[PDB]
């Protein structure tokens, strides 16, 4: 925020300007966007099963 290029600048999710992540502060952040391609099974009716993603850190520097 104390430099020319970063005067009053925000960071938000691509394509969704109303969801601001960072505003006028130094917070290193990465945004992972998820998109699904699916084929439902024929005749199967289901209500509320979850889709679970697990993240495991391998190396850091």
């Amino acid at each position: 925020p104390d430099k020319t290029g970063y005067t009053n600048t925000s960071i938000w999710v691509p394509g969704e300007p109303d969801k601001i992540i960072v505003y006028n502060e130094t917070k290193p952040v990465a945004i992972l966007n998820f998109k699904a391609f699916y084929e439902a099974k024929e005749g199967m009716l289901f209500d509320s099963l979850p889709v679970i993603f697990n993240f495991q850190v391998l190396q850091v520097g």
Binding site: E42, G43, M44, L45, F46, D47
Partner: protein, 60 residues
């Protein structure tokens, strides 16, 4: 959870045949000759009504 057989769809109509193909009403007359005479005379007519979607009739 639920596995649908995808068969529970139906559409229904009706059919009927409540009338015979023809109706016959008679207006015939009489033959009144003398005993042993020879002649000819018109008797009358017979009306043959035709019913729904009937186009050709074969009678005996």
């Amino acid at each position: 959870t639920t596995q649908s057989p995808l068969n529970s769809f139906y559409a229904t109509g009706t059919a009927q045949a409540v009338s015979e193909p023809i109706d016959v009403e008679s207006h015939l007359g009489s033959i009144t000759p003398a005993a042993g005479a020879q002649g000819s005379d018109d008797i009358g007519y017979a009306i043959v009504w035709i019913k729904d979607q009937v186009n050709d009739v074969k009678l005996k």
